[PDB]
Amino acid sequence: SGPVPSRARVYTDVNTHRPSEYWDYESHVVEWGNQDDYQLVRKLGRGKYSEVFEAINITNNEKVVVKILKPVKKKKIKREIKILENLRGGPNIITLADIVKDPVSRTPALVFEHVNNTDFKQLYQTLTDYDIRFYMYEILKALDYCHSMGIMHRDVKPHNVMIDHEHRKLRLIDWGLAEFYHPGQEYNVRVASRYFKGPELLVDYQMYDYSLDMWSLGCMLASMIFRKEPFFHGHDNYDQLVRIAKVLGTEDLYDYIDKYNIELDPRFNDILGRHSRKRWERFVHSENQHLVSPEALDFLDKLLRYDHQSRLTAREAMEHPYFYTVVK
Numbered sequence: 001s002g003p004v005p006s007r008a009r010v011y012t013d014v015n016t017h018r019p020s021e022y023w024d025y026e027s028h029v030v031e032w033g034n035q036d037d038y039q040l041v042r043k044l045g046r047g048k049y050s051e052v053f054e055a056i057n058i059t060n061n062e063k064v065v066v067k068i069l070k071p072v073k074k075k076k077i078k079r080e081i082k083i084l085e086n087l088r089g090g091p092n093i094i095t096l097a098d099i100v101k102d103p104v105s106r107t108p109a110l111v112f113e114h115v116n117n118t119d120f121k122q123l124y125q126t127l128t129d130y131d132i133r134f135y136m137y138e139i140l141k142a143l144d145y146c147h148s149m150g151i152m153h154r155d156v157k158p159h160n161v162m163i164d165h166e167h168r169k170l171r172l173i174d175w176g177l178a179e180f181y182h183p184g185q186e187y188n189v190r191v192a193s194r195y196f197k198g199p200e201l202l203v204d205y206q207m208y209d210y211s212l213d214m215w216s217l218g219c220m221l222a223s224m225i226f227r228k229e230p231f232f233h234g235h236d237n238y239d240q241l242v243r244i245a246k247v248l249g250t251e252d253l254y255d256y257i258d259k260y261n262i263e264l265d266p267r268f269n270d271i272l273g274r275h276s277r278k279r280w281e282r283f284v285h286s287e288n289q290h291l292v293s294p295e296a297l298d299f300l301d302k303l304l305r306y307d308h309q310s311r312l313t314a315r316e317a318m319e320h321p322y323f324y325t326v327v328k
Ligand SMILES: COC(=O)CC(=O)NCCCNCc1ccc(-c2ccccc2)c(Cl)c1
Pocket: 044, 045, 046, 052, 117, 120, 123, 127, 131, 132, 133, 135, 136, 139, 157, 158, 159, 160, 161, 162, 163, 220, 224
């Protein structure tokens, strides 16, 4: 009679018990600031429907970041604004400082606190085992907070984690794909970036939850400790599941599909094959052995699981022995 329903093991009913004002982003009243308070400095990057600039707030001479959105879907912009306002002040969440519009071009923009991004290319060679544990803990603070607030980020990846290494400061950014969690809701599986997509998205299981972010975090941890970027290198969404199955094995994949009565897409028929469950110790090499430990591999094993309900929650992850050396 179709797939088996699922719900989050934590913060299941946080939105259910809150008034509509909190989660009904379509009814939210957006109020513009003065675009003339900002002078654009330089282009930082581009998204599918966004351009990000460093700017200066001319009223206080403080640097900010301005994300100009191509308003292809108004409802999506309202959602990102409402989520950002709800989460404002959370640990390691990027702070939305203002929302402005360009009257001429009819374009909205979001203004954020400035983060001085450290270029990872130089950082990646210098990070120690302790540094990886420290920053992983900072990401978990951000995720436990947003999950506790009934929000799934749905786009956890290295590009969305900004680190100012000199000040040991981390911010989780780009809440454009984030959504409110409502138990039993069937969500769109076209979220997250290919390498970071959880198995639930790849098998088109729509009743997913906060645990999706924990898979994505597991992919980032594996890539950092093993110095393998990305860890699961799929060439398309179907091949992405095959890359996962080459590590986790096909036996546990069938156990997962069976548990939720998922119908595997026919496109998997000639590409999935048969794969044994690999030991995590097989990814250890001379280049990465100084970042790997038994505690790291046990932690990784508890995140990178097909069954979304079996993965550690952000709060359980924070209590793992891997973080015994970090200040809580
Ligand atoms: C144009 O858009 C923007 O300006 C945004 C923008 O500039 N983004 C680039 C941010 C790239 N961050 C790279 C990075 C570095 C280290 C880690 C990490 C290492 C060890 C443990 C935990 C995390 C992560 Cl996850 C990411």
